[PDB]
Amino acid sequence: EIVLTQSPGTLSLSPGERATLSCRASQSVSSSYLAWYQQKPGQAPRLLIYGASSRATGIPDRFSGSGSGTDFTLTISRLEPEDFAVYYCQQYGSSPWTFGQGTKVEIK
Amino acid sequence: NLCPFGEVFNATRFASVYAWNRKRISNCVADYSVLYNSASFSTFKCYGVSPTKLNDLCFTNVYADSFVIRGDEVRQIAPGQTGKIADYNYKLPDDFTGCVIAWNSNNLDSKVGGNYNYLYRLFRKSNLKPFERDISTEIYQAGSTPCNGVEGFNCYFPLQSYGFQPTNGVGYQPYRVVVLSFELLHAPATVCGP
Amino acid sequence: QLVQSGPEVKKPGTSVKVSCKASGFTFTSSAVQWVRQARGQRLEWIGWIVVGSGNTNYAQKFQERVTITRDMSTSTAYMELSSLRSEDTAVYYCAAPYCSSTSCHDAFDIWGQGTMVTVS
């Protein structure tokens, strides 16, 4: 369960972002109960996606994700190159709810 | 034709709050003097004309109920009285005509440890209708995501219990409750208590 | 929104409580989780407790090394631990899904200012 995986490590990019970020684990677990969050330098870790293909009433458009079950994916197809923070995966599903490796996004 | 209330408070396995029990008191009569006046009770909320005069009038029909409750949780023991019981375990009949003979038995119906002798409700679709029960142990579905019948985020097993033990304080101390619906029906009316 | 309690400076060896306060969303319609972090650290979990129940959950890291608590009158949530360690310094984030009495979200979205819980 505990060993989650996020391949892109510390991705390096620039403005004009079509970036994406994916989540795997050491185990096959649920699908409806996993999420990705956004954390800036000193900000409260905000909400991005609860469940792969999902959004909230206020979470920004051009924001999406996909996958299920075994493996998970996210992206933000277009974006104003404003902020490039750390992104955190977290399954909760069945106990023990736990948090992902965390992948950063910057600008060259 | 003698039906004492003994059989009720002698039900040493007092039923859980939601999973209360019943005895259709009918076609029987018995005298309940000492344990209604000389009783060592506490919070004798028994409605009707008064605590007395019931051992002076025949009954249309009488129904019995047992509750095992947290000490001051009695606050919620009234219809239209809100709380984490009416919403979940037993909202009494909105116009509850029967009464309540609850009283604290800290010794009785409790022993050291997380007593397994009583259970109650925490999570429901909505407020429980008056004068019924829930047996379900199905998980708490209320909202968007489904949960395929396993406990988890926004779907929890709704029957959590305060399995207290006698050592507590009065509000958290054991409290027997019995509820006695002296309901009133037509031509079959076959209970008396002189 | 949310307001965690103040930045609490307890001894490096102590027993510590922590308090969180809501706004709009009500605990008694959801659960609240505790997690840990610092300036640069992996956003690490602690546990979470239902609010309707005392049912709390946490890794095998906290079987006796954990304690959470709720307030149905103040609707202030709390955690604590007894006999912690100097390593246990962190910005203890409490979060909870936006819920308003059957108006719930499925996302641990609401993350307060963060009690800087400092064992010092």
Numbering used by the authors:
A (entry chain L): 1 to 27, 27A, 28 to 107
B (entry chain A): 334 to 527
C (entry chain H): 3 to 52, 52A, 53 to 82, 82A, 82B, 82C, 83 to 100, 100A, ...
Quoted passage from the original study:
Neutralizing antibodies that recognize the SARS-CoV-2 spike glycoprotein are the principal host defense against viral invasion. That is, immune escape and receptor binding exert competing selective pressures on the evolution of the SARS-CoV-2 spike protein, which is both the viral receptor-binding and fusion protein and the sole known target of protective antibodies (Abs). The ACE2 binding surface (“RBD-2”) harbored the binding sites of the neutralizing antibodies with highest potency but with the greatest sensitivity to viral escape; two other epitopic regions on the RBD (“RBD-1 and “RBD-3”) bound antibodies of more modest potency but greater breadth. We determined structures for prefusion stabilized spike ectodomain trimer bound with Fab fragments of three mAbs (G32A4, C98C7, and G32Q4), two of which (C98C7 and G32Q4) neutralized all variants, while the third (G32A4) neutralized all except Omicron BA.1.
